[PDB]
Amino acid sequence: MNVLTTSSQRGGKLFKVTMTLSPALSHHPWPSLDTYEPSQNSYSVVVPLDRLLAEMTYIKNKGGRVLDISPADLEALGPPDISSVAIPLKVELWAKADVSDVQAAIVAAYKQIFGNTYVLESERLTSAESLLRNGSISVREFVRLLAKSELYKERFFFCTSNNRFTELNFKHFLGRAPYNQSEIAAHLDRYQTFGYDAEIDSYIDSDEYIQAFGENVVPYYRGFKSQSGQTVESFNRMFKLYRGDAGSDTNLNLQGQKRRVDPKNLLRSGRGIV
Amino acid sequence: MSVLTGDNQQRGSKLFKITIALSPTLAHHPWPGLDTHEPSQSSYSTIVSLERLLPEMTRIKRNGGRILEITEGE
Amino acid sequence: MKTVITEVIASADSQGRFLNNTELQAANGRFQRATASMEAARALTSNADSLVKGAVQEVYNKFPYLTQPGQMGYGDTNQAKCARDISHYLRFITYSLVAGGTGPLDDYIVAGLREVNRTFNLSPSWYIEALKHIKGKVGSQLSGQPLTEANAYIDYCINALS
Amino acid sequence: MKTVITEVIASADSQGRFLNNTELQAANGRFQRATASMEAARALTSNADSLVKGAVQEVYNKFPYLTQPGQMGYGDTNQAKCARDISHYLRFITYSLVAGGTGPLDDYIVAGLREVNRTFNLSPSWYIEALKHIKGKVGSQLSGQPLTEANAYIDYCINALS
Amino acid sequence: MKTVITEVIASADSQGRFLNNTELQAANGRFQRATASMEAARALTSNADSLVKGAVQEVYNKFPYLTQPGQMGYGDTNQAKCARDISHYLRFITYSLVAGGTGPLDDYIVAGLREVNRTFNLSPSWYIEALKHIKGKVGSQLSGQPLTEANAYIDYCINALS
Amino acid sequence: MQDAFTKAIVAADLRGSFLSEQELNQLTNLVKESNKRLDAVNAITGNAAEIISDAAHKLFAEQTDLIRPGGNAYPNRRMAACLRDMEIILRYVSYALLAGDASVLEDRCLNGLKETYVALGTPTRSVARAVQLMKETAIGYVNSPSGVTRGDCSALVNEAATYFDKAAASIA
Amino acid sequence: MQDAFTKAIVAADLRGSFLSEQELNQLTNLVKESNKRLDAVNAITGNAAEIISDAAHKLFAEQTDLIRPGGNAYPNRRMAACLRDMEIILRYVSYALLAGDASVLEDRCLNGLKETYVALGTPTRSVARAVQLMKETAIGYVNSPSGVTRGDCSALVNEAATYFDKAAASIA
Amino acid sequence: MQDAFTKAIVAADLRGSFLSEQELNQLTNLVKESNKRLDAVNAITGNAAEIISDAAHKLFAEQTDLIRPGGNAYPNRRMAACLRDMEIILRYVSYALLAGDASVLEDRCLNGLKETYVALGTPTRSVARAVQLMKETAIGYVNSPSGVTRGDCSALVNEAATYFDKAAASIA
Amino acid sequence: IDSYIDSDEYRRVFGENTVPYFRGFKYQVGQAARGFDQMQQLFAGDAGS
Amino acid sequence: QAVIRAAYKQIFGNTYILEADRVVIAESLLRNGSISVREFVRLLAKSDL
């Protein structure tokens, strides 16, 4: 039932389903009380298209809750290829820029900071780019400017929860997944009492940020490689965070901007207080 | 020119132009060799808002570069 | 979608803050302004048919050559897709009027405009001239603050195309 | 300094954009609202003297112990600096009323408030109680939208202190 | 300025690395290909002007309304600035030929092209048609790898304008 | 983000149509009641702290387990997080109330929230209750304020309730 | 950032005073003329592209050296930068005009600008002239628009001019 | 990233061996046909815009639903996204064609792409078709260009097709 | 065939993890009286197949 | 093995299922764990044997 092979038999579109079952579907044949196996708390099964409506109806009745439906063939092509991003290409802006040296930087900051969503030409931050070109600001300075912009506020903040925002923030600004439940919490409390702007500053003035990017380096991916003071399970979070080269942050998804890192998963790396 | 243009998108209130002798506080080249920064970044003029003035200075000194000047931005 | 209401809410949210007197004053502007906006909207709505045919023709009268064979104002399909496109613009103008902001125009016509027009060999000049004409005729369907509103949004499209 | 006008301009600038109908609608709110705001401002302005003495006393009546020997409501200098401080609050309330936003309050009283109060052993409770009292009396100096405005800003200070 | 030489050096520098056999092999390509490039360059150099007058006229012959009064192919100054502009393009094509890359085109004509053309009401179609014509005639001035080079860069400009 | 007008516009566009005279007048009515709406949003803003505080006092009065060791509003750090969440939800409910549409609430607050709490071990039923108490008090304030012109705000009180009820349902 | 009210407030505060009846009525008058002000800002927004374009055509008509090789508006990259700066300055002038105060213009645009241009080799006198041309055309539009109620806008036309003149003076 | 040589090398290394005389001459042949390969890549680069444009015109000629409201290439924003994706895929196909290996196409473009589109609601069958049209026109250009020496490019036309066909298969 | 497996009676008793077994010889709630003798014809004894 | 040996006897009516005819894929899925006993059955019932 778990992770599948194949798609169809006569022909179908197999969908794999996931639920949470009562002892009504599955119980042991024991002398007392009806219980399902504790590890099949959420169970998944792959069903071809016709049997599918009948299965969902049954599951819902006897008590289960469907958690997901997704085609099997989507889910057979693995996990993302990460070769492009295991070790990236760094882009850095020099002291006397060359006229297109600076062109390189802007295109990359865009891609990285905005998480590969398209920024259309009406959309670009032109006045701010003027500034970088003249040297009035530096690459880190410019990077902070994009984050406080409406375009950044609008595709990533306004329409999703704070859990999601912060998780995106780590990906964009720091290039790495969020290590702890404390990190999520520490941030949510800051936004709540100092506002959005103070909270944005907190990733860009951090010691972690400063070491790796310094000030003239565009933030680049770095979570597919071992880092310091990183729990070990933050390397699996990175797969959940980045879905491949053609994937992007996208707020235009049918289901909306949502999570990607399970809250349960974060707790595995440690729980304390505050 | 780092001759600040406008308010340099800092918004806020007053603008202070602060110059520091930064070491590799910032700007270590991504290169394999020894955490240097370009030679012409010995003094780093930078314009910050009054609200962000104190935090920045604290992390400049904390990372070792020393402030060399300070003037109100205008 | 940019409206006075969404803008003030966005600005509050991003500072983690309840709406305050600054933001509610702003909203009152949008609500006080609705009457003029919505009068413009109703007039543009019922005249749509003729506003569109008027502007379509004016594109051919100002660019005579478009209607010769081998050209992009020739044959049923080009001339059909043109009427449609001006109709899209008037539609979003009415939406922007009703919505209290440029959002509908920004999201459905401005975002991507040039890339599309450039791939399809569509000159902005036509569209500006369609809109200049629509602006001429809307001078006598409306007046006062409804006209100012209609104008605001027509001009907004013309600047988007220059 | 946060006003409806500065907010919409900030939002335009940051997108490299001329002010559009969304932003001008917003501004109209602030201008339409000025009459009620400024009536509240004039009433709070001329009653300032007594509003301040009323609230100062109420801090001592609600915290009786403050007025003995060895306490922070004792001696000319404490009681003087108190009147002054409430006067600062009423002053910025009138400014926020006149300005069309919380800016004056945010920049001159809210930014830094807790750090200062904590270093100087000033309890917010006093200040909340000063403001609760000022709110009680302003119930009969104003009514309608001027009262709502006065309230908006008094309450804004009370939330800043909680 | 993008050439094979600058590209390999840029790639070495950015990895903090001496030039190695990969990078020197690359450079040999650029040097081996100089003869064909520079033959194209000399032929395009000596047979030059008439290409501009030919293309300028063709813009008016294809867009007749152009050479009529009130239009942008009328009067000495428009027609003068046109010849000049095509001459700029051919000039940068020769530079790109001689330089071993698109750099001169990227830095002096492509960067900013659309913004400029849009502010000044210059249609890319003219320029594409100027270049399509130049491409037709360069078919009989060159052949083999010099023609391929000339073509590479003419086509590069046409794609920059679409 | 949507407001009540923007919602109309999206549905119209999906038909390929200018707004129906039906939809036009529904929106004319929203403009008609907008002063009342502003007072209703103002009622919440002007008493935000007390609404949260009073909800809180009462939540822990009922559920004294949350403030024992082992409980999800113990020690100070957790209580501050719980007080903060009460504020966040009250905030997005007020935004929805200015907007005439729940979307900002659903998209930037409620989406994923239940699964967050379950991951954290935060008892969702207690959070739902804290939201029910905020509703009671918030509406209290919407209905009985300082020198507002007398009239009928029940339509708006209902709509505010559905935003509180959305949040509760979404979380429990 | 300041607007005309905020400016009043800052000066009052430096006295330790509630606003003078003097200052109150100066601000009452600004509210009195605010519809005209909105039309004036709208005049600029509604013709921004043409104002820049027309200023531009005329700047290069006068100074044909800028568009020769060696000139600061040559090649396309530099012309686009020059067109962009014309827009930036027109933009901050319109902001000042909505605000009734020059500060946003001086603080975000004019501060350091001259020294930038000198560092770049950009001829400041030509930039000053481009600003003078934008002024002529912008005011043209403020004075002769689409079906605005007839009245006297000279006070506002002056004030707009001083913002254009500030920029010119600051840059030349 | 792999090219056709790099691929050989990886397979050799997995044997622990110097390249087989078999593999050596396969690669000698790739060098033999490399001028043709350069012309083939050049054919695509030199007509990229038209290849995308012509594919596009034809895609929407066939599928007039995409350009209706409700359709995935409506309004301008979505059409621009669709036009861009056409360019992105044509770009990675040209890279594969210079390389003599599909890997850059599969790793940087095709990996995850189908699941992206399904998440977005983008009709994959329409995207597959747009890719089939790009193939027709691209190969058209590879086969009939400006004064290239006459010879047989069918081997390269096939290989280009398989890259177009990989993309189509991967997406549909 | 689907109907037997996918039915209330089969599912209620054999769950998703038990394997089917003879229950004809014991009273099952709801069976008709003749279930018992009828089952004997069907069953031939352990060798019987 | 218990489930698999058992299932066959129970569902094939105790007819000798010889080594040459096991349904090779029914069981594979059951071991790799994708399917239940209940869908293991539904896959034997529609088999040729």
Ligand SMILES: CCC1=C(C)/C(=C/C2=NC(=C\c3[nH]c(/C=C4\NC(=O)[C@H](C)[C@H]4CC)c(C)c3CCC(=O)O)/C(CCC(=O)O)=C2C)NC1=O
């Ligand atoms: C593999 C062997 C195996 C284990 C270990 C097992 C655990 C298990 N415990 C369950 C429920 C349960 N378990 C408990 C246990 C407790 N409640 C408390 O408050 C106490 C802290 C604790 C007793 C010490 C309760 C109350 C439920 C029912 C939960 C509910 O339905 O609300 C269920 C859900 C199915 C059912 O209710 O029968 C499973 C699968 N199932 C298994 O097959």
Ligand SMILES: CCC1=C(C)/C(=C/C2=NC(=C\c3[nH]c(/C=C4\NC(=O)[C@H](C)[C@H]4CC)c(C)c3CCC(=O)O)/C(CCC(=O)O)=C2C)NC1=O
């Ligand atoms: C705060 C708002 C703001 C302003 C005002 C601003 C001005 C500004 N203008 C610049 C360049 C420029 N500005 C111009 C302008 C002109 N050239 C001429 O010949 C004319 C006289 C004039 C047009 C009227 C040109 C040509 C450059 C490019 C100079 C170069 O790179 O060689 C630069 C360098 C960075 C860049 O090229 O993007 C800045 C910072 N930047 C800003 O962020």
Ligand SMILES: CCC1=C(C)/C(=C/C2=NC(=C\c3[nH]c(/C=C4\NC(=O)[C@H](C)[C@H]4CC)c(C)c3CCC(=O)O)/C(CCC(=O)O)=C2C)NC1=O
């Ligand atoms: C999008 C807006 C937004 C919401 C709604 C939000 C909820 C949220 N609540 C959290 C924690 C929390 N939430 C609570 C809330 C409660 N505890 C109780 O017992 C009560 C039932 C309830 C208060 C009524 C507590 C105690 C925690 C801390 C859990 C822990 O760390 O152990 C966290 C983890 C991060 C952190 O602790 O800062 C998130 C993301 N975050 C957001 O950004």
Ligand SMILES: CCC1=C(C)/C(=C/C2=NC(=C\c3[nH]c(/C=C4\NC(=O)[C@H](C)[C@H]4CC)c(C)c3CCC(=O)O)/C(CCC(=O)O)=C2C)NC1=O
């Ligand atoms: C753009 C390319 C580039 C250059 C050229 C460069 C030079 C450079 N040399 C430096 C230090 C240094 N350079 C030397 C070099 C010498 N000491 C001697 O006695 C000899 C005379 C000489 C060797 C021949 C030493 C000893 C230091 C360290 C000084 C110190 O920290 O005390 C530093 C300070 C940052 C650091 O220590 O990493 C820079 C930026 N940095 C660059 O990024």
Ligand SMILES: CCC1=C(C)/C(=C/C2=NC(=C\c3[nH]c(/C=C4\NC(=O)[C@H](C)[C@H]4CC)c(C)c3CCC(=O)O)/C(CCC(=O)O)=C2C)NC1=O
């Ligand atoms: C490295 C450790 C460190 C120090 C020492 C530091 C000092 C410092 N004090 C500042 C401001 C300040 N400092 C004071 C201090 C005083 N005002 C008075 O009248 C008194 C005489 C005096 C208190 C005894 C005031 C009032 C300001 C704000 C000035 C303003 O914004 O107008 C600022 C500007 C940034 C900000 O306001 O946060 C810095 C950087 N910053 C640091 O990071």
Ligand SMILES: CCC1=C(C)/C(=C/C2=NC(=C\c3[nH]c(/C=C4\NC(=O)[C@H](C)[C@H]4CC)c(C)c3CCC(=O)O)/C(CCC(=O)O)=C2C)NC1=O
């Ligand atoms: C939601 C907002 C929206 C807009 C504004 C829009 C414009 C638009 N116009 C198009 C085509 C077109 N547009 C025209 C326009 C004209 N032809 C003439 O006779 C006149 C000269 C002119 C009208 C003034 C023509 C002829 C085409 C067909 C282009 C082609 O496919 O060759 C297309 C290509 C898809 C298609 O063929 O329909 C788009 C996307 N699409 C949108 O979704």
Ligand SMILES: CCC1=C(C)/C(=C/C2=NC(=C\c3[nH]c(/C=C4\NC(=O)[C@H](C)[C@H]4CC)c(C)c3CCC(=O)O)/C(CCC(=O)O)=C2C)NC1=O
């Ligand atoms: C270094 C590379 C470079 C290029 C390519 C360039 C193009 C360019 N063409 C311009 C104008 C122009 N371009 C033309 C073009 C034409 N008129 C016709 O008769 C034909 C239709 C067409 C030729 C095909 C016209 C008429 C103008 C005058 C536009 C105006 O000012 O109204 C201008 C405005 C400044 C000026 O008036 O000279 C630029 C910058 N400038 C550069 O620096």
Ligand SMILES: CCC1=C(C)/C(=C/C2=NC(=C\c3[nH]c(/C=C4\NC(=O)[C@H](C)[C@H]4CC)c(C)c3CCC(=O)O)/C(CCC(=O)O)=C2C)NC1=O
């Ligand atoms: C600063 C932002 C802003 C606010 C807050 C605002 C409020 C406002 N509320 C009003 C009316 C009112 N407001 C209410 C509200 C209520 N009636 C009740 O009995 C309930 C307790 C309460 C329910 C919410 C009623 C009944 C009216 C009179 C009817 C109406 O005008 O719709 C009016 C019309 C003038 C008047 O009759 O007083 C204004 C201007 N205007 C603004 O620009």
Ligand SMILES: CCC1=C(C)/C(=C/C2=NC(=C\c3[nH]c(/C=C4\NC(=O)[C@H](C)[C@H]4CC)c(C)c3CCC(=O)O)/C(CCC(=O)O)=C2C)NC1=O
């Ligand atoms: C959407 C933002 C917004 C705008 C733009 C706005 C404009 C606006 N302009 C007005 C008046 C006016 N506007 C002008 C403006 C002018 N008179 C001239 O002759 C000059 C050409 C021009 C100089 C700027 C004049 C003279 C009046 C009438 C007098 C007055 O009401 O002050 C009025 C009062 C109603 C009327 O008399 O028409 C409004 C509402 N209101 C708004 O809410």
Ligand SMILES: CCC1=C(C)/C(=C/C2=NC(=C\c3[nH]c(/C=C4\NC(=O)[C@H](C)[C@H]4CC)c(C)c3CCC(=O)O)/C(CCC(=O)O)=C2C)NC1=O
């Ligand atoms: C690695 C290289 C790469 C690829 C291939 C890529 C695909 C890609 N296409 C996207 C959207 C899109 N793609 C299309 C494409 C189409 N619409 C149609 O109806 C047609 C069938 C088709 C054009 C042929 C559309 C319309 C969207 C926008 C969907 C939306 O936001 O609603 C998005 C979401 C982000 C965004 O909108 O910018 C990604 C990541 N992104 C990448 O980085």
Ligand SMILES: CCC1=C(C)/C(=C/C2=NC(=C\c3[nH]c(/C=C4\NC(=O)[C@H](C)[C@H]4CC)c(C)c3CCC(=O)O)/C(CCC(=O)O)=C2C)NC1=O
């Ligand atoms: C700047 C990068 C670069 C390119 C593009 C390049 C092309 C190039 N193509 C060549 C040959 C050729 N190219 C083709 C190509 C074709 N024949 C056809 O009929 C088809 C339409 C087309 C299929 C792709 C053929 C048939 C030859 C002659 C045979 C050969 O040399 O392999 C030659 C050998 C000289 C010659 O015979 O002309 C060169 C140098 N060299 C380079 O350095």
Ligand SMILES: CCC1=C(C)/C(=C/C2=NC(=C\c3[nH]c(/C=C4\NC(=O)[C@H](C)[C@H]4CC)c(C)c3CCC(=O)O)/C(CCC(=O)O)=C2C)NC1=O
């Ligand atoms: C359709 C409803 C229904 C009925 C009526 C029913 C009767 C029934 N009674 C049975 C056994 C039995 N019935 C009895 C009953 C008795 N023993 C005595 O001495 C008394 C005279 C009498 C009680 C009054 C006993 C002792 C057995 C077990 C016989 C054995 O296994 O040795 C069995 C064999 C299966 C089993 O043991 O569960 C059936 C099917 N089953 C059904 O499904």
Ligand SMILES: CCC1=C(C)/C(=C/C2=NC(=C\c3[nH]c(/C=C4\NC(=O)[C@H](C)[C@H]4CC)c(C)c3CCC(=O)O)/C(CCC(=O)O)=C2C)NC1=O
């Ligand atoms: C409970 C344990 C058990 C036994 C004992 C058993 C016997 C048994 N033997 C069978 C067949 C058979 N048995 C034989 C045996 C023989 N043929 C000869 O000529 C010899 C005399 C003899 C071997 C010594 C043959 C040939 C068949 C197949 C008959 C046929 O299909 O034509 C069958 C029919 C099902 C099948 O073919 O698998 C059963 C049930 N089944 C069981 O489950």
